[PDB]
Amino acid sequence: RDFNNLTKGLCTINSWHIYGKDNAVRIGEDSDVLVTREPYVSCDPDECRFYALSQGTTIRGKHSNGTIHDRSQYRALISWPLSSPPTVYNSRVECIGWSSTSCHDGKTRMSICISGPNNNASAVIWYNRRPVTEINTWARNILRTQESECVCHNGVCPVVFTDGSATGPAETRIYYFKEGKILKWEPLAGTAKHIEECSCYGERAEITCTCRDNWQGSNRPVIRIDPVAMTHTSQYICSPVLTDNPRPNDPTVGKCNDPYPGNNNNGVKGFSYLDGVNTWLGRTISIASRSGYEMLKVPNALTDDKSKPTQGQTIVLNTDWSGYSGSFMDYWAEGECYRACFYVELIRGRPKEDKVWWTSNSIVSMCSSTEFLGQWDWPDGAKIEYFL
Amino acid sequence: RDFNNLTKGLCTINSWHIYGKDNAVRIGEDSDVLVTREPYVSCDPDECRFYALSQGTTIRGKHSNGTIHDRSQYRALISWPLSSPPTVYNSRVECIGWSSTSCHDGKTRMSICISGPNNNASAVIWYNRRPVTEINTWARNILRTQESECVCHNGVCPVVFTDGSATGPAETRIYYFKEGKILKWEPLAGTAKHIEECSCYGERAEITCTCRDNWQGSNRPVIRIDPVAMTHTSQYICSPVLTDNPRPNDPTVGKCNDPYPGNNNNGVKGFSYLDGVNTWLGRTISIASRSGYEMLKVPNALTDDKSKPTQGQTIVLNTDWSGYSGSFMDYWAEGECYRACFYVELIRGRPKEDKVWWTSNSIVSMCSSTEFLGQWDWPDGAKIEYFL
Amino acid sequence: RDFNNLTKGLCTINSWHIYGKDNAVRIGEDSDVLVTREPYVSCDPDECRFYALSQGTTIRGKHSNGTIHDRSQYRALISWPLSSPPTVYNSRVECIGWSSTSCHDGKTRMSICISGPNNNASAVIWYNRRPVTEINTWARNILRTQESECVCHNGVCPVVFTDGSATGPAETRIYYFKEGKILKWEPLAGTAKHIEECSCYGERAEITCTCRDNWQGSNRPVIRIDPVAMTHTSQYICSPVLTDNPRPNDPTVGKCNDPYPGNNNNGVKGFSYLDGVNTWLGRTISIASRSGYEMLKVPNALTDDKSKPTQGQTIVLNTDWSGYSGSFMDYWAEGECYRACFYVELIRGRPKEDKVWWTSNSIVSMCSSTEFLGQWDWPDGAKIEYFL
Amino acid sequence: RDFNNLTKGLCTINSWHIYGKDNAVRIGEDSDVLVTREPYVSCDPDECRFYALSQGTTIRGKHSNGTIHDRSQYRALISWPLSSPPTVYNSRVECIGWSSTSCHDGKTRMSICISGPNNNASAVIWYNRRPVTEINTWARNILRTQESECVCHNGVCPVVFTDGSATGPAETRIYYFKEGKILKWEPLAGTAKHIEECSCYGERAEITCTCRDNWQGSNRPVIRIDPVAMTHTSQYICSPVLTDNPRPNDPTVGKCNDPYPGNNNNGVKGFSYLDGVNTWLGRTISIASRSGYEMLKVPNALTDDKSKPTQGQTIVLNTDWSGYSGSFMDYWAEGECYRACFYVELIRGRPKEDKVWWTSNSIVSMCSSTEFLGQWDWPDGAKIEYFL
Ligand SMILES: *[C@@H]1O[C@H](CO)[C@@H](O[C@@H]2O[C@H](CO)[C@@H](O[C@@H]3O[C@H](CO[C@H]4O[C@H](CO[C@H]5O[C@H](CO)[C@@H](O)[C@H](O)[C@@H]5O)[C@@H](O)[C@H](O[C@H]5O[C@H](CO)[C@@H](O)[C@H](O)[C@@H]5O)[C@@H]4O)[C@@H](O)[C@H](O[C@H]4O[C@H](CO)[C@@H](O)[C@H](O)[C@@H]4O[C@H]4O[C@H](CO)[C@@H](O)[C@H](O)[C@@H]4O[C@H]4O[C@H](CO)[C@@H](O)[C@H](O)[C@@H]4O)[C@@H]3O)[C@H](O)[C@H]2NC(C)=O)[C@H](O)[C@H]1NC(C)=O
Ligand SMILES: *[C@@H]1O[C@H](CO)[C@@H](O[C@@H]2O[C@H](CO)[C@@H](O[C@@H]3O[C@H](CO[C@H]4O[C@H](CO[C@H]5O[C@H](CO)[C@@H](O)[C@H](O)[C@@H]5O)[C@@H](O)[C@H](O[C@H]5O[C@H](CO)[C@@H](O)[C@H](O)[C@@H]5O)[C@@H]4O)[C@@H](O)[C@H](O[C@H]4O[C@H](CO)[C@@H](O)[C@H](O)[C@@H]4O[C@H]4O[C@H](CO)[C@@H](O)[C@H](O)[C@@H]4O[C@H]4O[C@H](CO)[C@@H](O)[C@H](O)[C@@H]4O)[C@@H]3O)[C@H](O)[C@H]2NC(C)=O)[C@H](O)[C@H]1NC(C)=O
Ligand SMILES: *[C@@H]1O[C@H](CO)[C@@H](O[C@@H]2O[C@H](CO)[C@@H](O[C@@H]3O[C@H](CO[C@H]4O[C@H](CO[C@H]5O[C@H](CO)[C@@H](O)[C@H](O)[C@@H]5O)[C@@H](O)[C@H](O[C@H]5O[C@H](CO)[C@@H](O)[C@H](O)[C@@H]5O)[C@@H]4O)[C@@H](O)[C@H](O[C@H]4O[C@H](CO)[C@@H](O)[C@H](O)[C@@H]4O[C@H]4O[C@H](CO)[C@@H](O)[C@H](O)[C@@H]4O[C@H]4O[C@H](CO)[C@@H](O)[C@H](O)[C@@H]4O)[C@@H]3O)[C@H](O)[C@H]2NC(C)=O)[C@H](O)[C@H]1NC(C)=O
Ligand SMILES: *[C@@H]1O[C@H](CO)[C@@H](O[C@@H]2O[C@H](CO)[C@@H](O[C@@H]3O[C@H](CO[C@H]4O[C@H](CO[C@H]5O[C@H](CO)[C@@H](O)[C@H](O)[C@@H]5O)[C@@H](O)[C@H](O[C@H]5O[C@H](CO)[C@@H](O)[C@H](O)[C@@H]5O)[C@@H]4O)[C@@H](O)[C@H](O[C@H]4O[C@H](CO)[C@@H](O)[C@H](O)[C@@H]4O[C@H]4O[C@H](CO)[C@@H](O)[C@H](O)[C@@H]4O[C@H]4O[C@H](CO)[C@@H](O)[C@H](O)[C@@H]4O)[C@@H]3O)[C@H](O)[C@H]2NC(C)=O)[C@H](O)[C@H]1NC(C)=O
């Protein structure tokens, strides 16, 4: 109808309730489920769906061997009905590639997929299911994007890309698209030293992205975008409650404008909702691997370098595998505020479970509740032994 | 369009004709059919569909092992086209959880799923396929609901929940929802001593629920709800024709305001249509197990403590497995009256058939006819031996 | 929109072109295809679909054993997209039963399914996907119907049923339905001595049905219905070109008002288009079994007891299995005339191919062309050996 | 709505970006994927889909044995969602046959399928999913058509057919259809000596077809059609950059009005976009077999007999199998010009990979970009060894 505008503030987050879960690996043990990774969730005005990068093979298929690799010509961004598994028969291909983002602007959806060799990748921006714009690699080193939904405001949908090193300074750009066409792009500015896989959400005409400093930071970089002025700023979450992985143990004081050191050249896509006292951080429980997942209420995490948790909720036990996590909200729901939501990628197989030759995942997602709900843990649920 | 109002009375029930049957277990022996239990049927203004709690695995899948358990993180309320089996590819997830109800109010559908550990479960109320309200456990002992459709009148959709003991007094509540929001809730009142899994239907602005007294009663408790005043009453079906299972043999006089004793701490979800002389009761044939199924015309069963059958119809032979049964009607059909319908869950596998490691079911359903139709029996139809 | 009226005459039939073919048995050798029999084709104003009586099991499934039997509680009328195979995932259940008919009246579709034991069957008439009317068996001996589409005119959709003996006089009735309700019914009248499985079509406000005299006739009985007056007549196709199976060899003179003798208590559903010189008859090539299939132009077959063929077209070689055949037309196509169409059921498995334990079929269908098209033969195409 | 008119010119082709890829063979190793060949892509005003000639069997199915053959009664034109594989459950049958074309005129789609024995084939023209016209073979020698989309302008959709010899002069005809009816047909005229499998596109009220001279030419014949005057001309691409396969090595001077000799009685469906300096040619890399695939910018190829490449893009490495290739464009996209697109059929199995008994393919397709994008190669990706 009309372009959606971020007119509401976030609802108060007092706990998280179960939103969706596809049990993909369990089901796929005996049904035609596509091998995936890098999933996320995104809503249209009339439906919310699961998204992920298929590996172009089923889990039981012989071609599942080798799916630990991230980039091949057989990957594609696919979407499917909320909480269903990504099957060969119900998956809809949005575009071809090994890195992506997607978001609905209120009128129609924009999907972006990047493909190519490491030194010659290119992004193609789709709008209303048609290719509209193409952007060639600018640093010739794995042009890559969010791996979770972008956000729009009055037709303008900003997207964060990075091209260049994963272990040193790189060239990050914020592109402002409208109807799949480039209105403008800026180089990253601010104090964030390295940006990758931004998880974003919007509220009151502002877009907040919590990203991954793969190079040096165990605290997460944050990019705040003004989609009207088409400008942005960057910093890190000040809080000592560190949320990347692997990471050192939490200190008593964090860092607001530099990566918190201790772990180099590695990380995991993650997210947060930064909203004063209504601030919640997601992170793996393990400081060593993508194991477990929890949400922590850390009032003023973004700006308070001594902020510590005041409440929490375990999502996945540290005795279960987790993975990527990102933000999304249903901007078309009823009510006076936007309900914060997130998903956690539950990776199965390689490298942690090497008895199988494949790597895939399933999805679990939650949304906030103003109630103080009882908690449960939500593991993938599949038995590797069954696949042997 | 507009909210549906229960303006009609029930059609005269002279017999039951076949409405739907999915042959899920038969078909699933060699196709991707999800393991389920606790099924039901519910209509939208333009379509009637099958519903059930998936176990998040196919029947032939290795994860079918252990599906005798009722509550896990892999269950979800799913719906699928009338008389099709619940397959991985045609099942639509309504919400995540291990106990549910769902009903269309004329404008859109409300679905409710409860999930959690036994001592910390929570219900999330979905409306128009979005989460709207959440209710935390109040007795910290398996918050649970109907396992069959709720009923609406002018936007108000009452739902019966129970939290606490399955073998002693518990805390039952009647919630009155409108557009997924709570208008009001009451504690159970009346003479029903224990309430579980209410089967409901509506006629002439009144909602009647036939439930399960798991603690002491072999006769069934009944809750009558006024969805306008948002009040209710409770009692038991007076009739000596006992309809829970297991149960003692039928006496000559029943009980109107106390559980009829003889069997404790067990039962099965069931239903009835209480409409004066146009009264029909469903029950398993066996007094020992979920075996067989029959419909009995017992004029004035609700209020006559000596009422006995005047007509009947066998649905499932006592040489075949049955299970849960509940009520539903198509409130959007043509005509001057509501046609009473019901489904019977035909459980296969554990515990009665232990040669297989799984537990699932198929569905059979009937609706009333004003004709006096010839009868047939409707078994699940699968051969366990084939799954060995 | 408005009820369709049979306002056009048939197009001139100069040959038959290929319309649809699903290759169900071939495909089903390695995919989830339902075992069926008694298929047909029927059109809605916006789509034409395949129909058949499922056996409630896939062909490769272990439950395919025994599917040679005609009536069980696991059968159902299902429809699916034109030329697709009837799979577990794309088949839509119209109703439950082991005998059926279905037709669209221009506004919505009426489907009828009969189920029950042999001595207590009942038909339930569905309209707009809801059960509306039920008819109990009147002769307590396998109440049965067309097994192909019915035809409507101004809302009135006549349907031919038979109850009683398959090897002696039976009770055939013509029911005139409108919106699923019975307007009127008549007993069969005229000279047809036994009626079963009528294949019907309509043109210029008249409905013509070519049926099966199972008891004595090798020539086919014909019922002509006036859907406005709601009256009918019956006779046999006069022509010596005999079209039932098994049958004696063709004589030089046929019979107009009595069954042509030679073969008792057996037959096969078949059809014809009786339109003066524009008359075509379908029949199996073999006089012994459901083998081969051909179309023969026999000018004035209905009324000329010496009529012989003037043109022909082989549909299935006598070295391939055939089966049932029936009529349908797309009453919603463009143009000034109705294009005659028909389907042939290609039965595979039992009894003719006993190396497999199942019985199923695939479908081939053609429609007329005013051109004189070259011919091809259209076999099922599956190799039984593959299923062993 | 209204018939589409070719009002735009082509966009400037500076490179090719990835548009769709289904990875059919990879996926089909362990899922119900239909065996196909002769694929293409075609757009409706609201969706773009993949098309191909199914072989009426899955790849893993036993009936895949023998699918190297081109014409059988089990083939059919099917379409399915962009970039999905052609599965038993998501494929839509357009018509029955072993040679086809299809195109949307802006209001609805016309599909054409030819079937029959070699000496008695016939084409049936479908419009709005109904059969409308039939054309009998005129030379009694494999009546055949494009194997890629036709193009329409103001309701008129020209289609090129050929009947007669594949190794000598044949009878090619250009039929001008409107709403599935024949407005007119012409015999081929011009200097093209043999025409087969035309790949066409339209721009500025002109339709250009690049075909296959199977008899003598290694350069490609070209047919330019005026869909308003309903007339055409034919010649060959003048350029020495030869694009059929097998072929001799490129000379320094080509031929404008005669086949370029060196290879007889063989070829492959191919295409080009002839637009002055904005001219691009597709061809296999190998001059011996359907191996590899590349796009070459050859300014004025059509009219310059000495034209050589000025730019290029590899699509498939010469170490990978290719196959047919053809043109299509989304005539309903936004913007001021038509974006040239094409697909390449990646054939797997027989005859080149004889360890398996089947022959199938997958699809890759690209569209032009005004950017100068980095390139990647796009192989089928399946491991034959897995199918053994
Ligand atoms: C049914 O469901 C409900 C709902 O879920 C269940 O209740 C939930 O229970 C969970 C688990 O207990 C709670 O989660 C934890 O929350 C605490 C925060 O709450 C405590 O602290 C608050 C703040 O206190 C300080 O400030 C306040 C405010 O000014 C001040 O008042 C106070 O005096 C003090 O100065 C308190 O307000 C709060 O009190 C309230 O609630 C109590 C119950 O929760 C109640 O008893 C009180 O009466 C009062 O009403 C409470 O005391 C989080 O701190 C905690 O997170 C830490 O712990 C988990 C392990 O449990 C760990 O994984 C987290 O990462 C985190 O700890 C790590 O990080 C810290 C920060 O750097 C670090 O300091 C720690 O050492 C630790 O670090 C190590 O681990 C990490 C991760 O591996 C690693 O990276 C580091 O390097 C290092 O190795 C939990 O989130 C929920 O809040 C609670 N929800 C609700 C609504 O109640 C209920 O239990 C269920 N019922 C049943 C029967 O099961
Ligand atoms: C073709 O299809 C048609 C349609 O389906 C088939 O016909 C149907 O046939 C079935 C089976 O026969 C019928 O079902 C039974 O119905 C009877 C009720 O009908 C009888 O009783 C009526 C009431 O009589 C008393 O009151 C009346 C009224 O004031 C008074 O007139 C009379 O004198 C007497 O005082 C009679 O009206 C009725 O008569 C009419 O119909 C006759 C045919 O049905 C006809 O002959 C007559 O001329 C007249 O027209 C008739 O006599 C039910 O009582 C019965 O249910 C009991 O039996 C089944 C086993 O069959 C059992 O499973 C049930 O649970 C129940 O019995 C248990 O519960 C009782 C109550 O507590 C208890 O007393 C019993 O001891 C027994 O208890 C034990 O078992 C249970 C369960 O395991 C356990 O929990 C207990 O602890 C204990 O162990 C059937 O429902 C249909 O009504 C009938 N339908 C129609 C339309 O006719 C036809 O047969 C088919 N054709 C063919 C060829 O197959
Ligand atoms: C490319 O495609 C085209 C299009 O399909 C192919 O051409 C088609 O070819 C087929 C096969 O040949 C034709 O089918 C047969 O048609 C004949 C009818 O046509 C003949 O007879 C006409 C009528 O003649 C009498 O009346 C006329 C009219 O007044 C009068 O003129 C004439 O003198 C005579 O008095 C002739 O008009 C007609 O002539 C025209 O066409 C000729 C070509 O067809 C051409 O040469 C002529 O110049 C002229 O232009 C022609 O002579 C059917 O009779 C025949 O059906 C019988 O035969 C098949 C076996 O072939 C059998 O299965 C049928 O059941 C039937 O025979 C049984 O039933 C009879 C009736 O009771 C009985 O008498 C027979 O003994 C036999 O009975 C036995 O078998 C049955 C079944 O098993 C059993 O039940 C009995 O008990 C008993 O055992 C075919 O249908 C098409 O018409 C023709 N189509 C067209 C448009 O041309 C072309 O061949 C293909 N090209 C290639 C290269 O392959
Ligand atoms: C990241 O991505 C980018 C984007 O894809 C990658 O860059 C691309 O790189 C590829 C591969 O190198 C390029 O493809 C080739 O393009 C050349 C054409 O370009 C050259 O020639 C131009 C024309 O020159 C003449 O005319 C001009 C104009 O008047 C005049 O200026 C000039 O002096 C001369 O007189 C030059 O303009 C052009 O220069 C520009 O670009 C250069 C880089 O490309 C740059 O260095 C310059 O500074 C300048 O900016 C350039 O020199 C094609 O000719 C070539 O195709 C031939 O070669 C391939 C094998 O590579 C072969 O398969 C083709 O079939 C073809 O060769 C066959 O056919 C010929 C014609 O008959 C024949 O002559 C050959 O002998 C050969 O024939 C044999 O093989 C065939 C097939 O098997 C067989 O049938 C025959 O019988 C026989 O056996 C390629 O298409 C892209 O253009 C380029 N794209 C862009 C935008 O730059 C980049 O590399 C990637 N980065 C990384 C790090 O990997």
Ligand SMILES: CC(=O)N[C@H]1[C@H]([C@H](O)[C@H](O)CO)O[C@@](O)(C(=O)O)C[C@@H]1O
């Ligand atoms: C485009 C791409 O290759 N993305 C990959 C990124 C990058 O390697 C890192 O961000 C370093 O830049 O991380 C992953 O490997 C990971 O950690 O699981 C997965 C993902 O596929």
Ligand SMILES: CC(=O)N[C@H]1[C@H]([C@H](O)[C@H](O)CO)O[C@@](O)(C(=O)O)C[C@@H]1O
């Ligand atoms: C929420 C829940 O666990 N419900 C379960 C109930 C309760 O156990 C009983 O009502 C006692 O409260 O009964 C079942 O076990 C049963 O009898 O088959 C199935 C169902 O899943």
Ligand SMILES: CC(=O)N[C@H]1[C@H]([C@H](O)[C@H](O)CO)O[C@@](O)(C(=O)O)C[C@@H]1O
């Ligand atoms: C309702 C029913 O049983 N119909 C069956 C009929 C009847 O047996 C005959 O018409 C005799 O009445 O014929 C079949 O067996 C047959 O010949 O293949 C199939 C069909 O299922």
Ligand SMILES: [Ca+2]
């Ligand atoms: Ca399978």
Ligand SMILES: [Ca+2]
């Ligand atoms: Ca890091």
Ligand SMILES: [Ca+2]
């Ligand atoms: Ca009880």
Ligand SMILES: [Ca+2]
């Ligand atoms: Ca007969």
Ligand SMILES: [Ca+2]
């Ligand atoms: Ca050639």
